[PDB]
């Protein structure tokens, strides 16, 4: 647990780490610790995938079994049946700095909704018209990736919340 929680570098949204597999409460207070199926209190009395990435504070509520939104239906879709936990905590003195952090991008446009537990590290230009945009992201043709820079001036709902979904 020490390798994936305290890691200095967290991957972006669309290309998230999948690390195969102490105590977890020895960190910053958690924005959301809502396990599904298994309960957090009976967890310690009880194949573990540890997928970690970063989310804007508005969109943390989109990581839940079976609901749509923005990044949920394009970047990281949980399956309808889920047995894991989601652990989201504050990270404002590490991943946010003045001028912005243009590292933690996210994929915004896709052809359609993706299968559960899938990532796609691609950048080919989305076509939003009828003219085939082979390599020109001009008008009515937009780049998929988009980065939301993190500033300390920004409010609570825009800070980078480092998250991990400990899917049992």
């Amino acid at each position: 647990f020490d390798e994936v929680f305290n890691a200095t570098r967290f991957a972006s949204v669309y290309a998230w780490n999948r690390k195969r597999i102490s105590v977890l409460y020895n960190f910053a207070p958690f924005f959301a610790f809502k396990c599904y199926g298994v309960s957090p209190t009976k967890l310690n009395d009880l194949n573990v995938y540890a997928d970690s990435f970063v989310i804007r504070g508005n969109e943390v509520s989109q990581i839940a079994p079976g609901q749509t939104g923005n990044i949920a239906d394009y970047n990281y879709k949980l399956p309808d049946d889920f047995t894991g936990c989601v652990i989201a905590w504050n990270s404002n003195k590490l991943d946010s700095k003045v001028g912005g952090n243009y590292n933690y991008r996210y994929r915004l446009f896709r052809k359609s909704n993706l299968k559960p537990f899938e990532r796609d590290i691609s950048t080919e230009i989305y076509q939003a018209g009828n003219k085939p945009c082979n390599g020109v992201a001009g008008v009515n043709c937009y780049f998929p990736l988009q980065s939301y820079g993190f500033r300390p001036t920004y409010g609570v709902g825009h800070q980078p919340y480092r998250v991990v979904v400990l899917s049992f």
Epitope: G99, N101, Y102, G135, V136, A137, S147
Partner: antibody
């Protein structure tokens, strides 16, 4: 914000170049520092940046193993060296601070050099 | 795979002249292009960034835009400030480095 480069100094061929620029008046660790060179009369050319919170110094393909890049955060300056300078490298060198901070390869589309230090020309 | 642009474009004072800049697939039309204005004997500064914004202090007469694989910047009025160098800067994905234009000089007619 201000960036102050080192003075001009002539170096013989086959030697190294000690050019440095100092950052002052802003948070040092939160802004990438690129490096841009200019031959007298030609266009601009790129060198590579520094992430001043770790050791990640990406370089261009034309200067992949000919430069040495070093951060000195104890005296809030950034150093660089040239190995086996020729008459083609006689130019002026700027160091520039891009807004924001990213150290990945595929993030520089949102990177423009906002402030630029003064020039320091080096010859053959 | 480097940006190319005309060395000089001449325009009479009082109205607008355009500076063109053409790039490849991986230089223009996939990545943003930025425009740098270089005062003579000084460090170049920002002129146009992200193709429809301007930094503060720049007068609202510098209009640059891109449509396909080329970009064009239109400068209106050439009295004593636009007799400088204009550089066409954009990010190249294939060579994994910033690449720049040849250097365009603007003179009055």
């Amino acid at each position: 914000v201000q960036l102050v480069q080192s003075g001009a100094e002539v170096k013989k061929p086959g030697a190294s170049v000690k050019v440095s620029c100092k950052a002052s008046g802003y948070i040092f660790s939160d802004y990438n520092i690129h490096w841009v060179r200019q031959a007298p009369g030609q266009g601009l050319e790129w060198m590579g940046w520094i992430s001043p919170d770790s050791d990640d110094t990406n370089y261009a393909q034309s200067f992949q193993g000919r430069v040495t890049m070093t951060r000195d955060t104890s005296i809030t300056t950034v150093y660089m060296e040239l190995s086996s300078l020729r008459s083609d490298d006689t130019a002026v060198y700027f160091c520039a601070r891009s807004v924001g901070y990213c150290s990945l390869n595929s993030c520089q589309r949102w990177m423009w050099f906002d402030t630029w230090g003064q020039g320091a020309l080096v010859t053959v | 795979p480097v940006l190319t642009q005309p060395p000089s474009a001449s325009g009479p004072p009082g109205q607008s002249v355009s500076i063109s800049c053409s790039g490849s697939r991986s230089n223009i039309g996939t990545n943003f292009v930025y425009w740098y204005q270089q005062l003579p004997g000084a460090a170049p500064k920002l002129l146009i960034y992200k193709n429809d914004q301007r930094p503060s202090g720049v007068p609202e007469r510098f209009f640059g835009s891109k449509s396909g694989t080329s970009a064009s910047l239109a400068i209106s009025g050439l009295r004593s400030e636009d007799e400088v160098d204009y550089y066409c800067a954009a990010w190249d994905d294939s060579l994994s480095g910033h690449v720049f234009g040849a250097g365009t000089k603007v003179t009055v007619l």
